Design a protein around this ligand. Sequence first.
Ligand code: CL
Lengths: 616, 616, 616
Amino acid sequence: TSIEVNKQSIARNFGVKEDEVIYFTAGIDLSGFKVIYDESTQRAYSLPFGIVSGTTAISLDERAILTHSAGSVDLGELAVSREEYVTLPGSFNFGHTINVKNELLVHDDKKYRWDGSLPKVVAAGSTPDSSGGVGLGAWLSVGDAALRAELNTKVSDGTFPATIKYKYGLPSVIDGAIYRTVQDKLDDFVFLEDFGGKDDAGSTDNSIAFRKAFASGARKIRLRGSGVYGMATRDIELPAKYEIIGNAKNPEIKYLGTDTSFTMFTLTGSGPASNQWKQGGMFRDLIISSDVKINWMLGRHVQNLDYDRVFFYNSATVLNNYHYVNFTRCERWGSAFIGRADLNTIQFISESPKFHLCFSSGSPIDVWDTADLAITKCTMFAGDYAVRTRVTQKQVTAPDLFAGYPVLITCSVFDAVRGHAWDLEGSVYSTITGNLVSAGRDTNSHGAYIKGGRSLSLTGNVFTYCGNYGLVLEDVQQSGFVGNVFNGNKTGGLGTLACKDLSIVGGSMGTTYVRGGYYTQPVGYSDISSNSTGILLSGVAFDEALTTKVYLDTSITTRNKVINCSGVPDTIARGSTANRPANPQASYQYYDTTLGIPIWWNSVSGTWKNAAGADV
Amino acid sequence: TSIEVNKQSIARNFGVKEDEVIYFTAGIDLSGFKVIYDESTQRAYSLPFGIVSGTTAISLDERAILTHSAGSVDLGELAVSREEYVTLPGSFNFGHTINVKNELLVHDDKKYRWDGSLPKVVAAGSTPDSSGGVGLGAWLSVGDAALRAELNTKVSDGTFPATIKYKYGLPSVIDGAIYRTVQDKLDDFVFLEDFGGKDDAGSTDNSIAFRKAFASGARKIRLRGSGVYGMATRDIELPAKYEIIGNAKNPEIKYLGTDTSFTMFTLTGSGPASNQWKQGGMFRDLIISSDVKINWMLGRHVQNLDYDRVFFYNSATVLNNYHYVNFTRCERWGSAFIGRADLNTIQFISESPKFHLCFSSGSPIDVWDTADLAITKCTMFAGDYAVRTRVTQKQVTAPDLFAGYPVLITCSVFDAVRGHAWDLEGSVYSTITGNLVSAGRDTNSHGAYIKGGRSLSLTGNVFTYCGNYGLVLEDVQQSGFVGNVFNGNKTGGLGTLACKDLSIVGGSMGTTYVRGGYYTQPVGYSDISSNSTGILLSGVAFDEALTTKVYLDTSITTRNKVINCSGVPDTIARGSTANRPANPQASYQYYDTTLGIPIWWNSVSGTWKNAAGADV
Amino acid sequence: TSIEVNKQSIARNFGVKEDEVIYFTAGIDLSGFKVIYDESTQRAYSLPFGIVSGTTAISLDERAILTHSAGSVDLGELAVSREEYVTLPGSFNFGHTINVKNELLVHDDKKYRWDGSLPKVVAAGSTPDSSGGVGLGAWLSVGDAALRAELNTKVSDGTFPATIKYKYGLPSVIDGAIYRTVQDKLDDFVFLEDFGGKDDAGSTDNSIAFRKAFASGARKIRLRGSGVYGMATRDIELPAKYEIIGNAKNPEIKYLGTDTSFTMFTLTGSGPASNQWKQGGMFRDLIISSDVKINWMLGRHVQNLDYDRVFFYNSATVLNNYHYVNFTRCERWGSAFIGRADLNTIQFISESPKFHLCFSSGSPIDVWDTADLAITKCTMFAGDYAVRTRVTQKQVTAPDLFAGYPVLITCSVFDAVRGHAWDLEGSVYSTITGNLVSAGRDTNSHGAYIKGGRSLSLTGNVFTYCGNYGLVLEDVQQSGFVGNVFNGNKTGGLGTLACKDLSIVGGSMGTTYVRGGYYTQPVGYSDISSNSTGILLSGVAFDEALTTKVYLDTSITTRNKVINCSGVPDTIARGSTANRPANPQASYQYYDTTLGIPIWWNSVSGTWKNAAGADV
Ligand SMILES: [Cl-]
């Protein structure tokens, strides 16, 4: 009487009543019962709900497919939906045959069911991956052990952020916000740390991190740390339109080696033509440093570079054939700017390095063959010199008489420079306005020295306490110098050597003995070698205590003249009869030293007359 | 014997011994046994531990709430704690009656138990959500299938980031750091990509993304890509204090259509009054472009706008009734600035568009009725003109005599402009300092042209290689011009037309033949139409090779005078007896052309005398 | 029989066939069976696969260790791998003895198994933590309830982001990208919100948030909100090189209290020396505000501070012993700058506060003992005054004659200031170029007032519609004033008091009656108290309608002279015979009022001669 005791045990397993279990036998009414039993396979299954009266059984096969008068039903599938499983003996490794959807095969302490066609044979030595894979239509993991292992794997294998859907502003419903992944959202920013960058002061070679970061296509790179990012691999080529952003000017990009030939970054165009200049980028909010003097960056055939709030230390910037470069709010310590143009084989010219709101100590600006160097609202302290311009090819062919380029220096301060604050050769169409200069004391040098200048304006500047003259002009022609003050300089205020057609107007020269440093300036203006012509002094207020206010040949032939300069005689038209003006205007007065009388040109008589009206 | 075989199967189910299972009937000693059985419901339950001797059973009700001599216990609740469940036949959808806390009802292949008040019937077609919801006191999901679906759902529906607690710096314990969600932390930044923005070169209409981003309340928007963000929907109104940030000047916000009337963005105040001006914002580090010429942005009744490191291409900025606008470090290619004020019906004025550290090619600045337009440390190349100012309405009511506004142009470069670099009408109280101008060669135009000027200063500029005159002043009164250089211009250096009371001081005029371009300038200064009065030339250094140094009527009545200009005689008081000064200063010297002698005014005798001292 | 019905119940439990269950007894062939049963313990276990024929049982102990002729097997271990468990009665709290690896003990409705040595006895009142902990070799949680609780705990306790492995750019394989955690990646940025900051208008004290954020080592802090961040705790000391970034100038950092002595932030160096100055940082893109007037920030012994795109409201910045401070693109409303240097006990000097592209209304700049205050491209409106400089120690010791410092003011606009636009004391080597000034109308004050000035240049400025004089110089020596325009001022254009050796050149004075406001200026230049010497006026274009063009004593001893000023007589050499010049230059012309004739000094004869050449 084995059957009803079997029905009892099955009922206890399924938590149903004893009379709700039935053996499958053909033709029976399946209605009302909740569990059916197969004698051949000795497997039990829950029956689908709502089997109506008169529904009779036809067949029940190895795959737990139950066929009856009303239709068919997969009891294996139903068991799965109800999480009623049988865990088969053995495992994937030793092999087994899967016949039913609710049969589980253990692999590595984890359970899997087959979702594909049945029956399914797994050979000995199989894995779920080795026998059809994991997913719909294949192996599907079941239960606690499998889930725990899978959760641990995906969280720790790096795939999880890509799986997590993200929408900005959730749980709030925001119109237009789209679904992305947490991976993608996080990828919105790139830090050097993402490529192995570390501010561990030389343990990590951050040069490599930069290289790999840029190689990925990234352009805008942030530094997380406040420490030193050591750089040990030279000549990392920057991509076009880079932007490297430090952590609020805290971290350092630093070379720690001893090789002065080391260079951190290169920026390199394909050629000298404008369509070959590589587009530059931004360095900002960081320190660029080296213990030894280096050229930290080398730029060749480049355009549109920016440096903003960068602290440079022993780190010179070298550019050759460069066009439009901004240094803004930078602090330059022992960090020269070196501008060249010899790589421009087309025009041999570079353009517009610009400095604004910068502080410099021991950091010269040295540009050759460069047009429109501009320095505005800057302070420069110490160094051998502050600003230097050079022209490499000085020879010209007629009708050209001179070669040079404009510089624009405005409302800037140049202080305690050891040599010249300004050492300007080939300065043409330059405007130099409202600057303060105090330089050259350490080497007895002029505060500013312009050698080779044409058609420029130097306006409203102050030159004080310089090591020689405040300003010396050598080989400067057709230029204007108005409103400048020349105070307390060692040897003189303003000096000229072999100049032609200059206007020197207003301003003041002398010594005001202001606390903080001055020499007793002995000379006001001097044409030092007495070989300039067309030098015009008008309205200059000279300190009466000046030993020599003006040193200048103002005889009739030199075209040098003085008008209304205090302590200095007005230039009078005078000289021998031979030196009478050839084509004087009407009523022109000339003191004839031969005759010892004033004479006047009479336009009507076409003769010189004395005051009595008689011809001489 | 059905009772002891049932007890055995139950024992095997719970994994206890056979003599540790008991049937419920009143009065029985419950001690020592581990599982109790209910004959009526045919359900088995674990017994609570530590039931001591002499404790006997009293009742066992509908829900396995068991009452005995020591007290009562909820075996259903106990079963839950032990995860010992019964999965009911059928499902939620077919409807069911839930009776016990350890009973599970399947919905969608997932199991749920009821945690609230019992019993409760679920109707056919019900879900956990439709029948009391999911949570404490309600439906609680149970088991593998439910957990897997919930985890899978939660990860992919966007709700997961909000569930993850985040605190900055973990696992390090950082004082003051608070718990947020990963969702909140991620929402700290807004990218255009978050609102469907895509740099797919015209496939996505990013105008919509901008609109929806701003509507959410977002103000500061970043661009992730380095490609082209197409813009196809015109006139997107910006919110107050926007900030749009490109990816290190790599990506383009670009109009790809052919409609020249297209505009990307509008900024619009509520009215003309100062309390109605909409506060502007920042565009930075990006390209704004169009293949056809457009006004990319239209601003009306606006204040405090900024553009920094923006590359403009064929994209004009049009502002009407605007107040304080900054262009810094921008590159303007074929991208005019157009400023108007006719929408200001209160004061009819716009204020302070400012340009600093900008490069411009073919990009004019054209402002009407605008005060304090300022251009500093800028470079402008080509175009029909560089700077133009206009006063739309010129009428004055007496005693007003003139209408105009100041412009401030400082240390800037204007090169190869086709027409005038400066075309300035209604320039009043202007300061123009240390600029370099070379313009007008293509159209035979003056480098700079000021028509209608009052009380301005133009100081220390250089005008070289211009298409006509370097600078022409027409209808300019009571203004100063010191230290300017006028070199190698086609027709002349400096010209005046119908001017009154001007000072022209120092500087220089001529040609220095510097390599790079020049004309042989034929004229220095010319009062071209001989109709100016009170024109004073002092201390100007002229190139002696100049064909015409000065063209000016300096006869006694004109108030025009020259002093210390090289190659030009000092202006002498001269003329007929009829033209003797009416009230001369003491000892006034006058050359009388009628008499042909110099005469001197004696203040004591009140007469003109000759040099011999006789009255004439 | 009891044995085969037990075998049946076991078979139904494991889902195997009845003849596949066998009882353990020594010597029996274990081959073919799938489940073995221990009658002593009344426990059933699955058997390992591949037990071959002729393999006979030897022993089976309490730990379910099975020994047979071929070898041994741990059935408890096998059961775990197959997830076939027995849940023991009771719980951790009541204590139990764990015998088999597949035995589970409940703690707090969650299940655990023992992975360590067996047997394992847990005393009453135990937890998994109290009895060996959780992990390999110890307690391991099992099943649904345990997993759900662990997932919920880990997700909500803040530890989850640290567990999620992250690599930039996944699933794309990017060379050089390294694995990090989601926690670390999120930690790349710091927002004030991360430390409890909230823009809830005074409910949250954000001062504390800043303090704790900075204490963590964070330097760069962002503000998420657009609202008001209330600040209620004074004197938060900033770290070196902070950067506080607002949300596109939307949010306010605001003091909402009523204590006018309140200060938000301090920045404090360790001493007066340069290596002790605390390195400053950046405030940008935000509003700093207060309802009452406060000094929002106090800086002492500091260097290199920046404020960019900051809107100040009632918030004065007070710095003492400060060096290099930038205000760029700022808007200052009722927000003075106060600079002092008395804390510098070494040199008593502060350096270079600089203002660029700023707008100010009612916000004076007040610096004492400060060198190189620089204002460029700025607009200042209203206030009692705009710019004031003072020197604290005015006494000097011979040979020093004066004490002062340079200011550099360039291309800036000063409008409708109630008092002086510039109130400059101790101005030395200053350059003031291309500015527009209209001030003092409310208090009948000069537009600009320099009291105590040496060796400075004031060039190409416009002074219009001022409340008194355009500019008054008191105790100014050896300075230049060229190209300035003085228009429509109430009392006069340019005035001097006790000055010495000044050049006043070109420019223009008068009234041009341009719509927008003017006075009828009555005076051009006036030496108001007739006590200046060496005052030189050259080439100034005066409005002919001026009542007084020049008021100046130009008698021979004063060294004051006028040349080429319209409507003003040239200073000519004249006087009595006794007053003939001692040591005259060659050909010197002198009008002798005694004789009533001009005479000329002949250098050869060493005599004065008349025009006829006879000695007088
Ligand atoms: Cl002589």
